[PDB]
Structures are given as structure tokens and as C-alpha cells.
Write a protein that binds this ligand. Sequence first.
Ligand SMILES: Nc1ncnc2c1ncn2[C@@H]1O[C@H](COP(=O)(O)O)[C@@H](O)[C@H]1O
Length: 493
Amino acid sequence: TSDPIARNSDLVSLFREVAATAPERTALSAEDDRISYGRLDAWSDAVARTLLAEGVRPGDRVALRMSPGAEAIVAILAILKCGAAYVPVDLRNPVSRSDFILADSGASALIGEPHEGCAVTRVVRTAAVAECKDAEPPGPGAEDMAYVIYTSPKGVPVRHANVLALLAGAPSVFDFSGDDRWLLFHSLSFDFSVWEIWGAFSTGAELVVLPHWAARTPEQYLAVIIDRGVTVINQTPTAFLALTEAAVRGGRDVSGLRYVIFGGEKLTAPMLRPWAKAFGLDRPRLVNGYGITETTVFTTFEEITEAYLAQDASIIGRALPSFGTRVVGDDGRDVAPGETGELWLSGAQLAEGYLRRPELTAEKFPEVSVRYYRTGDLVSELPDGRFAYEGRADLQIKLRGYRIELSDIETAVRRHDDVVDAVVTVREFKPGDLRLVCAYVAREGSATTARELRNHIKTLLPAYMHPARYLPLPGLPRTVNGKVDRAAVARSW
Ligand SMILES: Nc1ncnc2c1ncn2[C@@H]1O[C@H](COP(=O)(O)O)[C@@H](O)[C@H]1O
């Protein structure tokens, strides 16, 4: 085969081939600074030498604390070239979380800027990375770790082969080429960034760095994606709401985009209809992606169609080629098609397990012989094999003599045309009087009363599942990993 993705078994061999083949092509740009693949390859080899001198060796975990930018990408490549795995430290971590990640991962060096009180001593600072930039021109194997990203905190080691499997699966859904330009946006601590970086590099495309000046507003974001000829962007549904409003109000031309890829959050039609109204569904194509750190970024995709806009649920679509699936009931047996159950996943994109958590790993990665990962997500299979996303599987509570599926109440609230987000919690009204309540986010340009939401829910659910009060918020508060902060919601009440 001529295909570098199919032919290489690790990310370093892949990158080296893609660079050596056409080294003058642009790999990375930051404003007008264009860094060719050849330049990036030499630069990251020089930084790898610097890491070797700090005693980094194959199998090590090297911490990385940098904002997404050219130096950070050089640092990742250098770490991988040393046969080591990178452990990204979210810049916004509380100090204690960063301390735990560094301890738990056994990180033996850090590249970038240490957090205040950082216990890792062997540091290659960002400035030392930049110093290697224009100097001249043992490697990992498939089963070597490429990164350890922390979730919830549990460390998830993902191997070179896991990432290659994802990359080999992408073309079943996307038409990418080396003429695309991908925006690097997400924190290196989020696996969305693994996809932004390797989607670009695996295809010989250009990774465009969002400048620091453009970090704050959707107007600034749009200005850059249009100025720099970006063709692929990856966004949370939440970010997409802000992007749409800015594009529409600002009269911007979005039609240079080829793909907008959503991930991380439930996507429903009220989040999509305003963009589709202004811009249609072809240029760019919009594609909902569902996935998990434990199964290498993306598992299923659903390209958005008119049919998506006409229904009120969330459809995550079909699994990539590497995957086997089950939808599993409480009794541990498969549900009947159409029934809601827990998604279980198998295949080459599954991580090996968690780092130093044998107990959790055995529970979350059972064998059935086929090895599975229990997603903790409830889904249902549609007649055609596409999956609908329901909610997290840990949201049943006991209240007032009932078991109550909070995920079902959230889904029902999300069916309302003017709602873009919702969370249901329990709060105390008077002393011994606890009741369901719902905080929600209105679609921009709408306002819905609690009475109207009550009337909506009356048609869908029995009374014991009705929220007693509704609270509109200008967005729900999010945790570190970007999940809804149910404790912060409680405080907002
Ligand atoms: N398209 C999506 N729709 C709904 N939930 C999603 C989607 N993508 C990711 N998630 C949620 O995010 C979790 C993965 O979190 P993370 O491992 O931080 O990527 C999944 O288990 C889902 O609960």
C-alpha cells in the first residue's frame, strides 16, 4: 500500500515519513510564521536530544505544561521520538490535581513551565524548546505508550497503536487531505487535541495555531479561521453556540470551512438549527463525534442532515471500523434492539487499562473471549444501527419513594426547541422536603418560563419525574474535564 497511515505502526514513523516525503509543505503556522514539516522534524529531533540529556528514555512519562502553540507541538514530537509518553498538565488545574498527576504518572521530567510548587525538578523550559528551532537534522513501537491523559483522577495510557487505529478509521467518515488546514485549539490535556494534531499530521496537512490575542471571543476565533484559511475545526456544542451567534451577527463567511466536528457534550437540534438556517449543512459539513479518553478520542460519528434537525433527541451515529459494540442491561445481558442500555466497546482503540488501578481496570474493562470497555454511557440503538445518546449511567437516584432516572428527565427537558442545556438535581425546599429541580440554558433569542417548561414536561413524563422549579442560567458551570459541575449547579440554586 502507498498509504502512510496503513503502512506505519507508530506515530513517530508516520510523522517522519510524512515529513520526509514533502518537507517544504507547511506543518504548523502561528500568525505569519510558517514552520515546514522538514523544519519541524529537525527542530523536534533537536529537542529530543535535549530530553535525552535530561535522562529521558523509552517508556518514561514526561510531563508537558504548555499552552497549545508551536513549542508544545515540538515538545510532544520530541517526547514521542525519545520513546516516551507525554502527560499533559492542564494549565487551569488546581495545584493539588497537578501534584497528583505528576506523582501518579511517575513523570521523570517536565517540558514547559512548572506549576507553582511543582515536585518535578528536571525541566526543559519553553525557552529551551524555542532555542532549538533552526538547528540541523531508538524510536517507539506500536505497543509503546504515546500519552497518559487523566480523566475525572484516573490516568489513561494510550498507545501508538491505539492512535493509529483511530487515524485509520477516520477516512471511513471524513474526506481529509494534505490541503486541509486544521485549527489547534484545545488544551493539550484534552484528547480532542490529540485528534487536532494527528488529524493534521497523519494527512500532511497544516496545523494552524490560534494566537493568544484571539483566545477570548468567538469574533476573534472567526477572524483567525477565515484569515488563515482554516478548513477543519473541532468544537464542543457549547462553543458552537457562541460561534454561530458571532458568525451570523458579524456577517462572516464561514463557507471556507469543510468540516465542523463536535465532541464532548450531548448535541441536540436546537444547537444546530440557527447555523443550518444561515449556512446550510454542506459547506461546512457538520459531524457529531462521540468518544472517550479510554477508547482513543472518537468512537462514533453522525454527519448532520436535515433529518437530524427535524428530531428532538441526540444521535451519535455509527461506530468506527475498529469497534465492536454491545448495549447492555443491568442483568449484564444484551438489551433488545431499541431499548436503552450501557454501551460497551471492543477493539483496537481500547486503552490497556488505567494506570496503577488494577481494581478499577478489572471492573471497567471486563472480558466476555473479547475484551470490552464499559463506557458508563446509556445509549439506544435505532432501527438502522446508529446509536442515540441518552445520558450517563450513574444518574439514578432515590427520592420520595421512587427510583428516578435523572438522565431521562434531562433528555425530556432537552427535547424542548428553546433549550440548549439542562441539568436536574435535588434540593431542599423546607426542612425535610427535597425535590427535583432543573437548571437550564435557553437558546439565544428565546426566553421560556418555568410554567412553560412544566407544561412541556407534563406531556412526556409521569409526575414523580417533574422538576419542581426551573432556573435559567447563562450557561451551566463546568468541571476541569469540561463536564457539568453538579455541585456548582447546587450552589447556583
Ligand atoms: N457526542 C457526544 N454526545 C454525548 N456525550 C458525549 C459525546 N462525546 C463525548 N461525550 C461524553 O464525554 C465522555 C467522554 O469524556 P472524555 O473522556 O473526557 O472525552 C463520554 O463518555 C460521554 O459521556
